[PDB]
């Protein structure tokens, strides 16, 4: 038996688990998109071809560091690598580009002289915090400076303050107008220009930094497909970013990054305003107890699945592959679970940008995602989504459910959807069929953006439009049939689902057909 | 709110019940077919028009009694009444004809002298059963004769014996090779040529009687649409009936009537060989304890639903309306529960054939079935059917499920299916949508036979094919659109599901579209 | 080859459950659904009542529609005589309860011109004037019809239907004065005298209890009935009225509200809350609302009663044909099964036992079907569903009951034995609907009788004096139930059973569940 089918039949979740089989090989398609952060270790065209081949679907650009000219080159290279395969449209896999903003931060000043010197903080000692600028350059173990002018307004006696990536931990014992008197809870080495998190606080830093405003305008100019907006806390934040990309970039998918408590508390309003979500586990698990992170991940992927909006699963998934060519069992497990949890993307940071093994990381993510995709309990997952599906008399939605049910009934090798905007394909994906969704689009941006949705395989028709709209439709169907055939998703005989519309232009998708592969 | 929708939403069966609402009116469509036995009280053309109008869909002819000339006239009249409405194909309802065989029997002899005289059986008296032929003509209250040579082999001391349609009740007190000595439990008037059931005993009479052979040949000649084959006990039996209708009548649906223990015990093999099933509660509740009947009914409707084959629910459903113009609460309840149980047909016997109130019986069945159809727990019913659906790579099946899912998603006003053989419509019905299935067919037999399946509204296109196959398809779709409109199943604006094929001829139905009503 | 429909109880889907019901899977010997028989001409004799009890009667209904105090007093005397005839052996003694069903408020017409036996003929489409003016009481023709409901005008609009003689005749109001109505005949028929009137869809403002009712109820107090079926309950204030009337001296009598019209259904919630139980009065009900809609109301009501853990009764015409015939119609058989499957506590017999030719055959038939249907329930889901809709509470008694019921499912327990003073503990077990019979052991006779009102409680009345050590007194009552169960054939030595006790004497301390093998005692 194959593709974990015996397990997909089980009546109980428990029997489902009990029946997972290591000798049941997956289908060839892989549904979870893979996002790789590009950096020193992966910027070369020659390398990027190898990434795409290994399964990269999105390129992340981390505006934490690096200048415009530097990033512009990364993008130019990603593009070069991608179009290298454009010469055969059957096999060409689009690659999307993503601009991840630095976001607002709270940084400390320099330690006494050189930014290279450190001071030693003792569990229990007093540590005064000034905002007075005199102290910017000379930070010792008695006085520490911040660039968050308004820290006093947003903290109470008793609040924790986390310094250098939540290594050092302070607690506020007294609050003036200008200063704070803290006690060290967690000792350690204090350095220069280190980053500060205010756990629990409603931090009032603007939605976008001045750097961000400019970094974003650049992304518009460079024509990125999506932005990962950092440190989204409230929906007004998302609205800021939207305003900033403004008209010229009104089609760029804004993906809100949930990095602290306020973000979690206000996730609902946020999700509403966002195109998607990234569960930013790194920053998040500095702001909230680490043991609580899986809760937040599961809550978020859950609600994103309910709302049919893309969710990303980020940070440290294959961390050890920065140094080693194979991952830890926990890393293997982390990735499987994100997939089973029902995440759209999975992401690689260090592992691809700086690590010794970028390719090994991508292939590993590819391998696990496939195995985990077969291991889903679609029986229940489908039943559940269907039961929570709002009543709508929108034909597109009705067609999608019909299609997805049909695909379950006939172990369909794929659901083929003609889509101009991607909307139709999204509607199919939101129901999470086991079968890959081949989305056939003439719109390249649609092709790239589609990766953000579990199971959509974007496929870009480069032919001119044919005279009769009928034959043009048939042509695009036939294209997908060829793509599917060639990529080994199905052979002559197998059955497939095809979704078409009744008239040209967007949102007329309403025709579902069950077709045997020619 | 309408159509018991608030109740259809409930997460539990219990909440579902708790939420059934007497102020939530049904839609106008009624899905459960209604089978009326035609007889003295209903044979007139003038009456039959009124039956059709009231909701009769099949005419049952009981070959228990009546000659060929008699039945031939019933059929002539049914036909006359039906075609009376043929002048407007939008409103014309097809009517099927069904031949219900007499089947093998065990009969008694004549009472002392004229077969017009009777005897009295006294609770507690002795009643000898002979097979000795001396007694054939002279049966008194001391000695009773049977024509079933093999009774003694198949009955033990303690067995019950039912005489005259389980009116009189005997228990065997001593058993020889040649005779039985019984005690009367239920007193009553013993007549001539009265029928006998040996409850629990496995009666070995041949599958088809001599009369049956001939009655069946007649049904072939008369062009009936289905046969209700009596006293089906094993699959061999069904095979006999099929052989007898043979080639000339290979298209007539055989519906096996389960009338005794062996029939229930062997239901599986039977169902497999049959086109459908009738739960013959009268006979059945003479052969098995009456308190056990609802078990058998529920088991059989259940397994017929599982197999997607039509089940009928017969006998005494509105019994009191033989004498009275309104039914008892228990009768009302019986009918609702048949529908809730998931029966295709419901049936009337006495109530339409002999009763004082044939029309009131039909209208009553119509009224209840509608209310009960809304009261079904489709959420679970659908979930269950889907989970127990074989995985199949037949396109038609995949299209049907998709169509039914779609219809649930959009509160579809109807699922419109173009079908030549009826197969496609059956496949949609087997999934039990809330929405009516309008089947559009040019084949009149298909039209009539369709009534045997929950929710199919057969609609007969009498026009020739013209011009392009496409526009012929559109034409038939449009016909159904008009039928639906006129019968008040939906208005302009409402959304409907339409099933077509990709090519002419049977099979190939594989196109589902979600269309707003013009 | 299996028993008690076990293979079917295992099924993962409702559909598979149905598909697996088996006519060769015989039930256990216990029967859980209580059976209520109306006593009348055909069943009032002591000699007959012994045979009824034997056959499975658990409650005796008295219909105050008809019959005088002296008459009913005698029926009760006899029921009691028949019952205590078996009191000589407490192991085999079955308690029988007594129930007073009130006549309730009515709307009656006057006498047809001259003899109260003579009739008029009403033609579809004719005009029919309705007066309340008393001049017309004695002389009712086909043009003018009198009612005794002085307030009809206030409670009906132009367009309202009026149903005369048990919804045989049907009028629609065309004009409404201060004093009169002008109606049109929709349903023709023969109009008689003193015939009953229903106002479908009206909020009928007749008092909750009639003057007759007040008195009939006071009688029930005096006669020491266990429950009252209050007729024509419409709003909760109605139930409060009945309670007020039974008042203090009768504060322990269970009031069971009878739902017989629209307002009753519309307001069922408030009503159920104020009632001890409910009767689905299908006859009257299906005159007030379209008959085709009644199964909706029945199913809604039994449903919500199950949710609330309050007793529900299913009434009227369940085995109607057995007034004249010794066996029922397939639809009657089916009706009874479905009431049980629907999850009704009691089933009822009216005509069938009171006036019919075959009272005993009706009782035995109800007994037979209920047993079969009880095995046919889908306990898996029924239990899952009740548990999921159970509020979280910190009440030990509830925790013990669920535990008990789950344990009984686990071990195919032959019975759940509960020592109960008020019945409350047994009710709490029953509200979860175990397959196993609940033997409730009580020294309180009223508790014994009232217990019948709940699916699956088998009341068993300990007549012994209290034993010195409270422990051994507890053991004694457990042992009693063990003996009863043995003798009634509910289990044998070896079988396993669940026993519920408390930690201290007096009510509401039940918190001990044990799993005990049946002894060689
Ligand atoms: O994916 P979207 O934006 O909903 O648009 C889907 C549209 O694509 C089609 O299937 C074909 O696209 P064209 O308009 O480019 O012919 C339409 O028939 C349909 O309405
Ligand atoms: O040959 P026709 O009458 O045009 O048939 C066309 C339609 O009938 C179908 O054959 C229906 O299938 P069935 O007859 O098997 O039910 C389809 O291929 C198509 O939708
Ligand atoms: O010895 P007693 O007072 O009869 O009570 C025996 C046990 O049954 C209970 O009375 C339960 O009775 P209730 O159902 O009336 O609460 C316990 O509280 C007690 O332990
Ligand atoms: Mg960050
Ligand atoms: Mg027969
Ligand atoms: Mg199963
Ligand atoms: Mg009444």
From Swiss-Prot, chain C:
Mg(2+) binds at residues 260, 284. There is a cross-link at residue 154 (Glycyl lysine isopeptide (Lys-Gly) (interchain with G-Cter in SUMO1)). The record marks 258 as: Transition state stabilizer. The modification S-nitrosocysteine is found at residues 411-412. Changing residue 425 to Y: Unable to bind FBP but still activated by serine. One of its GO terms (molecular function) is transcription coactivator activity. Beta-D-fructose 1,6-bisphosphate binds at residues 420-425, 470, 477, 504-509. GO terms for cellular component: cilium; collagen-containing extracellular matrix; cytoplasm; cytosol; extracellular exosome; extracellular region; extracellular vesicle; ficolin-1-rich granule lumen. Residues 377-421 are annotated as: Intersubunit contact. GO terms for biological process: canonical glycolysis; cellular response to insulin stimulus; glycolytic process; positive regulation of cytoplasmic translation; positive regulation of sprouting angiogenesis; positive regulation of transcription by RNA polymerase II; programmed cell death. The modification N6-acetyllysine is found at residues 50, 77, 154, 254, 258, 293, 310, 421, 463. There is a cross-link at residues 103, 254, 258 (Glycyl lysine isopeptide (Lys-Gly) (interchain with G-Cter in SUMO2)). Optimum pH for T3 binding is 6.0-6.5. Increase in pH causes T3 binding to drop, does not bind T3 above pH 9.0 or below pH 5.0. Its EC number is 2.7.1.40, 2.7.11.1, 2.7.10.2. Pathway: Carbohydrate degradation; glycolysis; pyruvate from D-glyceraldehyde 3-phosphate: step 5/5. The modification Phosphoserine is found at residues 25, 85, 88, 115. Substrate binds at residues 61, 258, 283-284, 316. Keywords: Acetylation, Allosteric enzyme, ATP-binding, Cytoplasm, Glycolysis, Hydroxylation, Isopeptide bond, Kinase, Magnesium, Metal-binding, Methylation, Nucleotide-binding, Nucleus, Phosphoprotein, Potassium, Pyruvate, S-nitrosylation, Transferase, Translation regulation, Ubl conjugation. Belongs to the pyruvate kinase family. Catalyzes the final rate-limiting step of glycolysis by mediating the transfer of a phosphoryl group from phosphoenolpyruvate (PEP) to ADP, generating ATP. The ratio between the highly active tetrameric form and nearly inactive dimeric form determines whether glucose carbons are channeled to biosynthetic processes or used for glycolytic ATP production. The transition between the 2 forms contributes to the control of glycolysis and is important for tumor cell proliferation and survival. NCBIfam families: PRK05826.1, PRK06354.1, pyruv_kin. This is Pyruvate kinase PKM. It comes from Homo sapiens.
């Amino acid at each position: 038996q194959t593709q974990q089918l015996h397990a997909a039949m089980a009546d109980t979740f428990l029997e489902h688990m009990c029946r997972l089989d290591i000798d049941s090989p997956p289908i060839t398609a892989r549904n979870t998109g893979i996002i790789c952060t590009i950096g020193p270790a992966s910027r070369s065209v020659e390398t990027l071809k190898e990434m795409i081949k290994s399964g990269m679907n999105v390129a992340r650009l981390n505006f934490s560091h690096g200048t415009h000219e530097y990033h512009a080159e990364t993008i130019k290279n990603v593009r070069t690598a991608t179009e290298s395969f454009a010469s055969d449209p059957i096999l060409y896999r689009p690659v999307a580009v993503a601009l991840d903003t630095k976001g607002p931060e709270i940084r400390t000043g320099l330690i006494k002289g050189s930014g290279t010197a450190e001071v030693e903080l003792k569990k229990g000692a007093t540590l005064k915090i000034t905002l007075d600028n005199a102290y910017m350059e000379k930070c010792d173990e008695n006085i520490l400076w911040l660039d968050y002018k308004n820290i006093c307004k947003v903290v109470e006696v008793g609040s924790k303050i986390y310094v250098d990536d939540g290594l050092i931990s302070l607690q506020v014992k007294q609050k003036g107008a200008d200063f704070l008197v803290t006690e060290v809870e967690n000792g350690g080495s204090l350095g220069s220009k280190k980053g500060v998190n205010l756990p629990g606080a409603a931090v009032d830093l603007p939605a976008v930094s001045e750097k961000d405003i400019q970094d974003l305008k650049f992304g518009v100019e460079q024509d990125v497909d999506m932005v990962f907006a950092s440190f989204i806390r409230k929906a007004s934040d998302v609205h800021e970013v939207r305003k900033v990309l403004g008209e010229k970039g009104k089609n760029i998918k804004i993906i809100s990054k949930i990095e602290n408590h306020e973000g979690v508390r206000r996730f609902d309003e946020i999700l509403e305003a966002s195109d998607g979500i990234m569960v930013a586990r790194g920053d998040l698990g500095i702001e909230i107890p680490a043991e609580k992170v899986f809760l937040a991940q599961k809550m978020m992927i859950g609600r994103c699945n309910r709302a049919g909006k893309p969710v990303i699963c980020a940070t440290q998934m294959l961390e050890s592959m920065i140094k080693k060519p194979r991952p830890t069992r926990a890393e293997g497990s982390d990735v499987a679970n994100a997939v089973l949890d029902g995440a759209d993307c999975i992401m690689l940071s260090g592992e691809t940008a700086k690590g010794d093994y970028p390719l090994e990381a991508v292939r590993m993510q590819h391998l696990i995602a496939r195995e985990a995709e077969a291991a889903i309990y679609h029986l229940q997952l489908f039943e559940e989504l269907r039961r929570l599906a709002p009543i709508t008399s929108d034909p597109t939605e009705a067609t999608a459910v019909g299609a997805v049910e049909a695909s379950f009934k006939c172990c369909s090798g794929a659901i083929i959807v003609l889509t101009k905007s991607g909307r139709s394909a999204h509607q199919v994906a939101r129901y999470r069929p086991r079968a890959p969704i081949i989305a056939v689009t003439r719109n390249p941006q649609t092709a790239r953006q589609a990766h953000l949705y579990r199971g959509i395989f974007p496929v870009l028709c480069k032919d001119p439009v044919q005279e009769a709209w009928a034959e043009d439709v048939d042509l695009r169907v036939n294209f997908a049939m060829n793509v599917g055939k060639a990529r080994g998703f199905f052979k002559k005989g197998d059955v497939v689902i095809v979704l078409t519309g009744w008239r040209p232009g967007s949102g007329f998708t309403n025709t579902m057909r069950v077709v045997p592969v020619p």
